[PDB]
Amino acid sequence: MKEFYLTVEQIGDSIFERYIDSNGRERTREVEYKPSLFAHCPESQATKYFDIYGKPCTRKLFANMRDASQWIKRMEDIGLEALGMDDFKLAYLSDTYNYEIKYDHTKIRVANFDIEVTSPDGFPEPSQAKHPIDAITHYDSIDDRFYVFDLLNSPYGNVEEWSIEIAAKLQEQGGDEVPSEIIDKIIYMPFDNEKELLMEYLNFWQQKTPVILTGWNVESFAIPYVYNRIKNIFGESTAKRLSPHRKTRVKVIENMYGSREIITLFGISVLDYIDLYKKFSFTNQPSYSLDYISEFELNVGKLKYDGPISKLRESNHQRYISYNIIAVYRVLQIDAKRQFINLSLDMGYYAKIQIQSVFSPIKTWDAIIFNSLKEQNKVIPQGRSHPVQPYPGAFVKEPIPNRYKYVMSFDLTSKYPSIIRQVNISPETIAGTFKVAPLHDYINAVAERPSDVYSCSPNGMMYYKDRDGVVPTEITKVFNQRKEHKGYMLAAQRNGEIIKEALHNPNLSVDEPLDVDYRFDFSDEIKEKIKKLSAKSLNEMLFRAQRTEVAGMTAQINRKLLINSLYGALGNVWFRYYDLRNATAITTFGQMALQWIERKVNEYLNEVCGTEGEAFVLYGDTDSIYVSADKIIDKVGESKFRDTNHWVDFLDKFARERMEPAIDRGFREMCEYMNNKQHLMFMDREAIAGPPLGSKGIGGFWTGKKRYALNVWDMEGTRYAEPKLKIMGLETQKSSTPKAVQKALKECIRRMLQEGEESLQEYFKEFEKEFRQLNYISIASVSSANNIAKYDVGGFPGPKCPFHIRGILTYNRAIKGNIDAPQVVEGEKVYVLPLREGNPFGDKCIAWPSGTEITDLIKDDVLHWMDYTVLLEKTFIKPLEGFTSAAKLDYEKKASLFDMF
DNA sequence: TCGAGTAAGCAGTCCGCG
DNA sequence: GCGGACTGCTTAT
Numbered sequence: 001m002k003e004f005y006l007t008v009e010q011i012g013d014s015i016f017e018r019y020i021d022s023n024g025r026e027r028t029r030e031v032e033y034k035p036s037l038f039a040h041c042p043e044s045q046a047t048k049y050f051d052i053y054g055k056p057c058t059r060k061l062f063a064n065m066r067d068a069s070q071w072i073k074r075m076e077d078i079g080l081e082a083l084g085m086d087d088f089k090l091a092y093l094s095d096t097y098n099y100e101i102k103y104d105h106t107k108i109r110v111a112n113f114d115i116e117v118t119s120p121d122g123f124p125e126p127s128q129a130k131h132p133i134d135a136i137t138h139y140d141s142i143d144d145r146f147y148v149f150d151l152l153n154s155p156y157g158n159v160e161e162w163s164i165e166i167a168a169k170l171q172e173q174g175g176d177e178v179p180s181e182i183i184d185k186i187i188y189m190p191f192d193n194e195k196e197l198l199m200e201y202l203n204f205w206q207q208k209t210p211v212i213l214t215g216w217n218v219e220s221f222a223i224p225y226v227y228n229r230i231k232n233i234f235g236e237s238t239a240k241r242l243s244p245h246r247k248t249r250v251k252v253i254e255n256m257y258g259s260r261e262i263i264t265l266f267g268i269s270v271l272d273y274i275d276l277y278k279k280f281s282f283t284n285q286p287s288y289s290l291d292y293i294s295e296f297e298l299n300v301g302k303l304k305y306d307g308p309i310s311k312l313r314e315s316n317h318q319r320y321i322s323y324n325i326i327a328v329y330r331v332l333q334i335d336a337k338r339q340f341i342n343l344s345l346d347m348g349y350y351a352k353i354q355i356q357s358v359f360s361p362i363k364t365w366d367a368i369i370f371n372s373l374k375e376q377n378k379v380i381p382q383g384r385s386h387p388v389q390p391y392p393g394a395f396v397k398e399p400i401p402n403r404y405k406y407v408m409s410f411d412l413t414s415k416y417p418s419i420i421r422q423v424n425i426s427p428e429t430i431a432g433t434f435k436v437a438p439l440h441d442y443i444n445a446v447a448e449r450p451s452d453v454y455s456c457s458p459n460g461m462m463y464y465k466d467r468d469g470v471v472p473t474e475i476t477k478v479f480n481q482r483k484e485h486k487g488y489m490l491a492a493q494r495n496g497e498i499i500k501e502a503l504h505n506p507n508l509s510v511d512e513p514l515d516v517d518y519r520f521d522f523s524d525e526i527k528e529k530i531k532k533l534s535a536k537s538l539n540e541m542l543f544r545a546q547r548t549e550v551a552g553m554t555a556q557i558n559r560k561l562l563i564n565s566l567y568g569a570l571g572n573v574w575f576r577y578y579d580l581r582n583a584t585a586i587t588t589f590g591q592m593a594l595q596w597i598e599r600k601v602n603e604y605l606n607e608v609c610g611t612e613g614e615a616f617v618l619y620g621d622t623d624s625i626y627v628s629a630d631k632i633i634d635k636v637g638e639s640k641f642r643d644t645n646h647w648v649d650f651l652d653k654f655a656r657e658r659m660e661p662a663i664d665r666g667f668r669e670m671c672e673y674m675n676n677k678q679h680l681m682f683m684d685r686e687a688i689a690g691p692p693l694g695s696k697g698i699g700g701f702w703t704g705k706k707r708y709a710l711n712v713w714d715m716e717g718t719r720y721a722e723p724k725l726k727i728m729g730l731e732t733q734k735s736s737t738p739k740a741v742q743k744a745l746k747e748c749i750r751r752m753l754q755e756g757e758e759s760l761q762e763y764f765k766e767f768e769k770e771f772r773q774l775n776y777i778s779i780a781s782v783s784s785a786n787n788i789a790k791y792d793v794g795g796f797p798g799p800k801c802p803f804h805i806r807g808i809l810t811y812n813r814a815i816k817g818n819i820d821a822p823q824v825v826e827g828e829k830v831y832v833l834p835l836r837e838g839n840p841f842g843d844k845c846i847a848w849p850s851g852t853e854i855t856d857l858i859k860d861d862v863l864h865w866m867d868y869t870v871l872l873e874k875t876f877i878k879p880l881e882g883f884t885s886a887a888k889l890d891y892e893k894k895a896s897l898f899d900m901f
Numbered sequence: 902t903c904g905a906g907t908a909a910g911c912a913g914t915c916c917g918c919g
Numbered sequence: 920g921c922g923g924a925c926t927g928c929t930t931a932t
């Protein structure tokens with residue numbers, strides 16, 4: 001096989017590399033790598049190396065990496081550019097793997113671990129590591145085994161061995177319900193002292209050294225705790241055995257308020273799953289506890305136990321160990337679904353970076369572009385310091401707040417990357433500038449043509465047209481990958497809807513789910529078989545279809561993120577190719593594109609309707625336009641349609657056969673106006689929305705910018721079995737809104753859009769009447785909590801203290817002394833509840849850590865003093881009032897003359 | 902919240918507005 | 920009571 005790296009590090013003048021050799025075996029080597037850098041040279045000197053602007057360079061080969069680093073410093077002292085890849089390990093990878101890397105994931109050791117630490121006196125701080133590590137579960141992907149290290153004897157209690165027999169039994173048998181599919185994969189090792197546990201763990205680690213190391217909060221807790229505990233018991237040298245090269249660094253992570261330490265393990269790639277999840281899941285969760293995320297992702301029940309976790313080992317060591325094992329498995333289950341490890345490997349090997357650098361799109365793109373340029377013997381520029389400066393972004397149209405009955409939307413494929421490609425925007429393609437007119441003049445095609453030679457953006461920038469820039473070339477490659485995966489995602493989505501339709505008429509029989517590839521649209525034969533399957537088989541297929549859709553979503557949405565982040569990197573001062581001229585060229589072109597096509601669509605529809613100055617485009621934000629289709633429907637007349645699906649078909653056909661060609665003509669003209677390199681503004685129909693035929697539903701509404709709701713029947717060619725609410729920006733979509741209130745507001749919206757005013761009124765009246773019965777957690781607001789100390793003045797709120805911070809201060813006063821009280825953690829999220837006048841907490845609200853029950857001794861008081869009236873007004877009535885005023889509806893029935901009878 | 906970007910919404914504080 | 924100046928937070932794209 002072709003060789004591929006696992007990890008790479010620079011340690012002084014050596015590159016240390018772990019890799020898979022041509023026979024599929026893991027190897028390690030130390031290489032005295034001699035890096036090269038570059039300086040500009042005269043024309044007279046013959047060279048094969050040129051910088052991205054075509055200026056000749058001479059290659060400097062250094063005796064070692066330290067000499068090269070020192071040369072860079074001396075060049076700074078002289079005031080001359082030192083060109084080339086200054087991150088020498090990336091140059092090493094480029095030289096050693098000068099081909100498209102094909103990797104075999106089955107040869108990569110992926111380790112997933114979790115530790116337990118009993119701590120009677122609060123949270124066990126990893127920097128101190130003052131308490132025994134009393135359990136480690138470490139899953140190894142090559143062995144496919146869970147290795148469980150269990151401490152039986154501790155200063156906090158001696159316990160009996162964990163029983164795999166009890167672990168496997170149902171909870172109704174007094175067991176722990178460790179899933180049957182992993183029971184045979186557990187290798188259980190009890191220890192009568194912590195020193196032998198840790199020594200054995202290190203020997204195990206030496207034999208099965210992780211390449212990818214993951215888990216939940218492993219970077220912020222487990223890794224520093226293990227390292228520091230081992231360091232405390234044995235000394236530094238023993239702790240450094242967690243690194244295969246025996247090198248570690250305490251790394252200080254900081255943001256704007258406060259800093260924290262992590263431990264860099266040289267020769268390991270740590271991908272903490274909480275951080276993978278935050279970057280790649282496109283959620284914003286009220287809590288990031290593993291129990292909360294597991295429930296959300298997997299629909300598994302919370303791991304229940306009596307008493308605090310600090311007393312679980314002594315009271316129920318059996319459950320303690322079983323829950324440690326289950327926690328490790330839950331991360332594996334989340335990854336089986338979301339596939340973020342697969343994503344990280346894919347993108348890491350594509351860019352030729354340390355796999356952990358997938359968290360940094362700047363590093364990822366730096367490597368991709370470097371490797372691309374190096375293939376042509378071109379030399380990358382030196383990175384430079386820039387002051388942070390603002391620059392303009394997207395245009396957002398101010399909508400007229402209203403109900404909107406029939407709506408069709410249109411959206412550009414990968415807009416900003418497509419602009420980069422169309423205009424040919426790159427560091428080395430800048431051709432000059434032209435005299436800019438107001439944007440309005442370009443939008444209305446009255447400004448003089450910018451250039452008859454170069455490709456232009458309405459910010460004044462001109463670009464070469466003779467050859468693609470490196471940014472366009474490389475963004476296109478990742479875009480094409482994205483397009484492939486989006487195809488699989490949408491097919492799986494369409495397939496899911498076929499199965500949902502089939503579930504209306506399930507067959508009474510015993511059978512199996514069909515063995516099919518859900519990434520491809522079901523054939524006629526598969527569809528006929530589906531119509532004869534049982535509900536059980538259909539539901540199994542639906543689950544599999546949905547999992548395939550999720551896999552496609554991960555692959556496509558994060559490649560979209562990567563290419564959009566290349567645009568973003570152009571506006572980040574740490575990017576080697578930072579240039580606000582190019583960042584602004586993209587955003588300003590984007591503004592024009594939106595408003596240009598708004599004009600073109602209005603013009604087209606006014607023509608086919610025989611009107612003048614009528615506004616068909618009701619809204620647009622950044623890219624998409626939303627078009628009112630009322631007049632189109634009315635042109636034929638609602639009575640002509642047999643059912644909802646008939647007018648959806650009609651609008652689908654109208655959009656595709658009439659509107660899209662007009663939009664295409666419109667953008668082709670804009671391309672010629674700007675003299676762009678290639679027409680790539682492909683705006684296709686997105687949503688078709690409206691009320692069910694014959695209903696009193698309103699279809700949709702806008703309250704303002706970034707705030708709307710639509711009842712959608714078809715989305716990008718997926719025809720839903722049941723209509724789907726597309727709600728953007730409204731409180732239903734905000735993690736700060738209480739769970740039960742999201743649910744209620746969503747149902748109010750559903751009733752508004754699908755059923756009408758009377759239906760809304762019936763539901764509102766009931767919610768208002770019954771909501772005090774809702775569980776306190778489900779009606780609590782959520783907020784991130786920053787700068788708690790800044791507003792703490794002797795335990796009381798300082799000037800301008802935020803409401804949620806005031807709540808935390810109230811909580812802190814209430815738990816003074818209470819030893820079984822969780823502390824609110826700076827920068828994490830809290831639940832927040834209002835409190836009625838005269839409550840014993842002495843303030844108008846209280847807050848506590850999100851994802852948790854509030855501690856027992858104040859819970860009864862919070863429940864007794866909760867201000868349901870304020871809660872309802874702020875979280876439910878106020879937002880609903882906004883929805884209904886915008887939609888011109890009443891959520892309460894107003895008096896009429898009929899009341900007199 | 903270490904990790905690409907800007908636009909813009911709403912909650913809440915403080916305090917003016919005769 | 921509502922709105923502007925401001926901080927804080929969270930969303931749309």
Ligand SMILES: Cc1cn([C@H]2C[C@H](O)[C@@H](COP(=O)(O)OP(=O)(O)OP(=O)(O)O)O2)c(=O)[nH]c1=O
Pocket residue numbers: 411412413414415416417560564567568622623624906932
């Ligand atoms: C979602 C998102 C968009 N944008 C910008 C760049 C996008 O091209 C532009 C429009 O956003 P979108 O329409 O959400 O996405 P897209 O056009 O890139 O891809 P597609 O519609 O094919 O799924 O807004 C960002 O800069 N960052 C982001 O995270």
Ligand SMILES: [Ca+2]
Pocket residue numbers: 115116324327
């Ligand atoms: Ca635990």
Ligand SMILES: [Ca+2]
Pocket residue numbers: 128228231232
């Ligand atoms: Ca120490």
Ligand SMILES: [Ca+2]
Pocket residue numbers: 411412413414415623624
């Ligand atoms: Ca788009």
Ligand SMILES: [Ca+2]
Pocket residue numbers: 411412413684685686716
């Ligand atoms: Ca599309």
Ligand SMILES: [Ca+2]
Pocket residue numbers: 502505506507530531532533
């Ligand atoms: Ca059937």
Ligand SMILES: [Ca+2]
Pocket residue numbers: 411623624
């Ligand atoms: Ca969009």
Ligand SMILES: [Ca+2]
Pocket residue numbers: 660682683684
């Ligand atoms: Ca099209």
Ligand SMILES: [Ca+2]
Pocket residue numbers: 411686716
């Ligand atoms: Ca889309």
Ligand SMILES: [Ca+2]
Pocket residue numbers: 856857858859860861
């Ligand atoms: Ca009490």
